């Protein structure tokens, strides 16, 4: 019977039992089934209630602290399949820590379409070990078997049987009155009749009639036209891997929700397109789109008050976020990179904007992609933007790489002491909010005032750059009074890309990548400037200056901002070729491996490599055995503005003293084989003497054409592979048998000394007796043209001889036999 009753979806039951009566008529508990929040429900409340139609649980059956119920015989005694369409922690059934749940009540459900079961810390669940967990799932995954009241045997399990069909646990049962209908262990996720009878794949859970799709109690693959269809016609979309839903159905869901208005992917109706895909408004299809792509992404609670990394991490997987925003960012030292990683790709917001309590910011360049506020959620007074509490808001976005034309809402700039109104002017002009004649509440009493956005700029009239030291002397700056100028503040940092500045830096407190330099102002005649004390050669740096002038309570400012120059340090001698690794891959081939200079100082044109024969030593032939402190600038030394305030106070004190005095004073009328390695870090030195050391020079040359600006020598001694093949004693041992049986041993030196031969081993042996070995020193070897067989014995002698080279011993020669007669 294909779900003869009502198809009712999932629900989270709390403090109620009425919906259980609906389950009687229900055949499919669509979705999940959660029983929780039983803080006032007792076991007597739940009694044995049967559902003569219930066949499905499309999702997992969650039980949580159900103080009600006395057993599972009370609720759900009739059930056919726990669909594995959706899971919970990869468990298609979670029964977690509930008191007052002792027995069970089912015998027909022997399958879960897919997933697992989380039997964790059961408090009274009996008849658990009586049922095996391998007859219900396709495969075991994350399955807990421990923490049961029967594996632990914490329940008195009575088994009426293993009808009660034939197959620690006494038998296969579910209650003192319910046995298990164990079927062949092939209907794991496809289920079997409640008589221990397995059937085909189409039928799921139970099968009164084993085969055919129109006789299945529950369907496995898909449902359409009253039968368990294996595949859904494209008009009927594959829905939740269990049925076939018409296109009208999916369009109706799409319109009802707009709730994730339903779409279709691969002719499968789904609430929203899968990640890595995007909207296709033809059949609401899902066309691939990698990365966070523009989609209907409604921010949680219609906004996202971002003050932490996680709050800003919710933008991923979405590009056009729906909902307003409250910018509550505070703190963070050089951390906005992660932000722009999460927000730089965002370019559209449905609601308004709020900037409440944002202080760890300086400039606004974080959004070069955003160009329009939808303003669906419109603030009071028709506002799509709200900036406030920005104690440090120096500058806003440019109008070259960032565009903006606001369609609705106004602009709000309050409590922004570091915000000068020129930026606000640019915002309103390009956006057009003021152009829309909208009264943008801009607190001029907080914006512009207590902020100095001056027009004066400086330029380096004199420049002198070296590989480490850069000398500068810019134009002198002179405000209306010579006393107005209060020194200059230089700012320099590296320039990998000539597009960065301090406003492109951390734009917050803490250690910024940019470095600050201060210069004594000239006298009103010298050119203000600075000579760098040292820099890494062959490196570019962005440098600019912003001077200091006198400031009073009236906000009197004359600040001059020298322009940013991206200048690269000059090159110098390249550093050493790192890691010379010379190994011999053959008796004539040596492989040298190394790394380029630490400081290239221009492209490494080539490398200089040599080698010197480190042959065998002469004495081996004779060997016969027969303080540091921080210097200059500091990167971990901050400067407090209180010093600036005290300096200004002191300077004002002195100037007031001076003026006091002046007005009081006056009243008006009363060599070696070598190779050059070009752009390589490994090379085999073929053709070298065998068993020969090679002190290999290694230099790195970043210049080859004008000069050989080469690094210093890196000497490594690599010895070629020794050859011991030639230590075998050559020639039979001719026996110069003298009168006294003195055999002047005629055995010749092997073909090669293999480096050098230290001695000779002669294993001459009295035939048919204990063997003997004789060491023949090279001096003695030459003296006796071999050796002398003295003190011999009558009879034959077995004489094997093996040389002793330094590259390895050879082989024992043939045993030469001479018979000493009687």
């Amino acid at each position: 019977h294909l779900y003869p009753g009502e198809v009712c979806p999932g629900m989270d039951i709390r403090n109620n039992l009425t919906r259980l009566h609906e389950l009687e008529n229900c055949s499919v508990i669509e979705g999940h089934l959660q029983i929780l929040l039983m803080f006032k429900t007792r076991p007597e409340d739940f009694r044995d209630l049967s559902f003569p139609k219930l066949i499905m649980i499309t999702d997992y059956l969650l039980l949580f602290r159900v103080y009600g119920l006395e057993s599972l015989k009370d609720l759900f005694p009739n059930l056919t399949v726990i669909r594995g369409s959706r899971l919970f922690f990869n468990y298609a059934l979670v029964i977690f820590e509930m008191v007052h749940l002792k027995e069970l009540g089912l015998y027909n459900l022997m399958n879960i379409t897919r997933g697992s079961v989380r039997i964790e810390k059961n408090n009274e669940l009996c008849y658990l070990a009586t049922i095996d967990w391998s007859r219900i799932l396709d495969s075991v995954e994350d399955n807990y078997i421990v923490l049961n009241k029967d594996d632990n045997e914490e329940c008195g399990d009575i088994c009426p049987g293993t009808n009660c069909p034939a197959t620690q646990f006494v038998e296969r049962c579910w209650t003192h009155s319910h046995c298990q209908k164990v079927c062949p262990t092939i209907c794991k996720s496809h289920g079997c009749t409640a008589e221990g009878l397995c059937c085909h794949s189409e039928c799921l859970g139970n099968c009164s009639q084993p085969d055919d799709p129109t006789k299945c109690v529950a369907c496995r693959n898909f449902y359409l036209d009253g039968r368990c269809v294996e595949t859904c016609p494209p008009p009927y979309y594959h829905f939740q891997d269990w049925r076939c839903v018409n296109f009208s159905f999916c369009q109706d869901l799409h319109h009802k929700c707009k709730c994730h208005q339903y779409v279709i992917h691969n002719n499968k109706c789904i609430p929203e397109c899968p990640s890595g895909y995007t909207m296709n408004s033809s059949n609401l299809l899902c066309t691939p789109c990698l990365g966070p792509c523009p989609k209907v992404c409604h921010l949680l609670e219609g906004e996202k008050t971002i003050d932490s990394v996680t709050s800003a991490q919710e933008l991923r997987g979405c590009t056009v976020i729906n909902g307003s925003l409250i910018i509550n960012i505070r703190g963070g030292n050089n951390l906005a990179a992660e932000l722009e990683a999460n927000l730089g790709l965002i370019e559209e917001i449905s609601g308004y904007l709020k900037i409440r309590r944002s202080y760890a910011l300086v400039s606004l360049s974080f959004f070069r992609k955003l160009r329009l506020i939808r303003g669906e959620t419109l603030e009071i007074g028709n506002y799509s933007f709200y900036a406030l509490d920005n104690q440090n808001l120096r500058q806003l976005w440019d109008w070259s790489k960032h565009n903006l034309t606001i369609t609705q809402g106004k602009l709000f700039f309050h409590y922004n002491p570091k915000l000068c109104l020129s930026e606000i002017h640019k915002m309103e002009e390009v956006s057009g909010t003021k152009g829309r004649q909208e009264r943008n509440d801009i607190a001029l009493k907080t914006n512009g005032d207590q902020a100095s956005c001056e027009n004066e700029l400086l330029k380096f009239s004199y420049i002198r750059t070296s590989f480490d030291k850069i000398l500068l002397r810019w134009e002198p700056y002179w405000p209306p009074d010579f006393r107005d100028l209060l020194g200059f503040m230089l700012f320099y940092k590296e320039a990998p890309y000539q597009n960065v500045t301090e406003f492109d830096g951390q734009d917050a407190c803490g250690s910024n990548s940019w470095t600050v330099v201060d210069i004594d102002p000239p006298l009103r005649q010298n050119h203000p400037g600075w000579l760098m004390r040292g820099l890494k050669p062959w490196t570019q740096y962005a440098i600019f200056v912003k001077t200091l002038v006198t400031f009073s309570d009236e906000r009197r400012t004359y600040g001059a901002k020298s322009d940013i120059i991206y200048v690269q340090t000059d090159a110098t001698n390249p550093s050493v070729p790192l890691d010379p690794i010379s190994v011999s891959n053959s008796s004539s081939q040596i492989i040298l491996k190394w790394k380029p200079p630490s400081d290239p100082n221009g492209n490494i044109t080539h490398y200089l490599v040599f080698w010197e024969r480190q042959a065998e030593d002469s004495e081996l032939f004779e060997l016969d055995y027969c303080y540091e402190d921080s210097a200059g600038e500091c990167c971990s030394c901050p400067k407090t503005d209180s010093q600036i305030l005290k300096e200004l106070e002191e300077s004002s004190f002195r100037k007031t003293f001076e003026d006091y005095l002046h007005n009081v004073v006056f009243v008006p009328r009363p060599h070696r084989p070598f190779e050059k390695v070009v752009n390589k870090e490994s090379l085999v030195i073929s053709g070298l003497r065998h068993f020969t050391g090679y002190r290999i020079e290694l230099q790195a040359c970043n210049q080859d054409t004008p000069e050989e600006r080469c690094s210093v020598a890196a000497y490594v001694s690599a010895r070629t592979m020794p050859e011991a093949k030639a230590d075998d004693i050559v020639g039979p041992v001719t026996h110069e048998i003298f009168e006294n049986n003195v055999v002047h041993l005629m055995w010749q030196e092997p073909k090669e000394p293999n480096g050098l031969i230290v001695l000779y081993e002669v294993s001459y042996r009295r035939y048919g007796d204990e063997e003997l070995h004789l060491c023949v020193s090279r001096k003695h070897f030459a003296l006796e043209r071999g050796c002398r067989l003295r003190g011999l014995s009558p009879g034959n002698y077995s004489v094997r001889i093996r040389a002793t080279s330094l590259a390895g011993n050879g082989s024992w020669t043939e045993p030469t036999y001479f018979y000493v007669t009687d």
């Binding site: 002179w478 405000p479 209306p480 009074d481 010579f482 006393r483 009103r524 100037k655 001076e658 003026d659 002046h662 009081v664 004073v665 006056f666 009243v667 009328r669 009363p670």
Partner: peptide
């Protein structure tokens, strides 16, 4: 500029007058 009070003002004023005999306050 020419808003001189301090070193420049004094050096200008002394040459401007007083070499003739400065006014006594």
């Amino acid at each position: 500029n020419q808003h001189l009070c301090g070193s420049h003002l004094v050096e200008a004023l002394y040459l401007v007058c007083g070499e003739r005999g400065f006014f006594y306050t």
